[PDB]
Amino acid sequence: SLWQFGKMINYVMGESGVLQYLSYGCYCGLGGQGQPTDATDRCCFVHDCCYGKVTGCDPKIDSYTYSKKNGDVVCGGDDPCKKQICECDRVATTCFRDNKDTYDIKYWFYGAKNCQEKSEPC
Amino acid sequence: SLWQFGKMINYVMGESGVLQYLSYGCYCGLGGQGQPTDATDRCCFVHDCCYGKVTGCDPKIDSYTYSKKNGDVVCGGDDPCKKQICECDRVATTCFRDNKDTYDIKYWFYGAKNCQEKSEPC
């Protein structure tokens, strides 16, 4: 669920994590349109394409199973649909950490009026 | 500034405050249009009309002065324009706490395609 994705972002990125990633560029948030702005916005484009392959369960409200091992997050459980949602969430938090050196404040709370070009294929 | 409105919401409502209130209904977010959905969404409509009466400084990017006394938020400083922006943010925080009994998960991360009716005037 989105409550679990928020707890995962603060463990990997620090105390101000959720406020820094809730709205950035043309793709960071639920849904999106147009073309990506930089490397950080591209991590969120891949996350939307991953949620689109899920059939039978809901990514906003359904709960999955996970554990923490000395800094490393690992997915578990026995339902195939719920485990698929946990893997989409784990891969995006590692992409945010690898690209921290190019994050730019001119793109935080950007707007939809600047995302009006022909949309990029998955 | 918008960074200050987020930190004030986490002090009054608790740890999961920013994830619950910065994306909800037709007006809690950037670029509002249409008709308010419920009581919590109407607290955000009144806050948008309050910002429109400020004529010599910018609500999105300019920083103000504030502190705490007996558990309540208090606004300060030596510039009248900046103090007016602080007062709009404090009143909205009290409206969220007074209406908590009626919050609904159906309106959390609501899509923009559901808000295309004519807009209610201030």
Ligand SMILES: *CC(=O)c1ccc(Br)cc1
């Ligand atoms: C899918 C994605 O990138 C994303 C980013 C932030 C939040 Br909150 C929800 C989803």
Ligand SMILES: *CC(=O)c1ccc(Br)cc1
């Ligand atoms: C004025 C108001 O309620 C509001 C809420 C969210 C965001 Br982002 C901006 C403004």
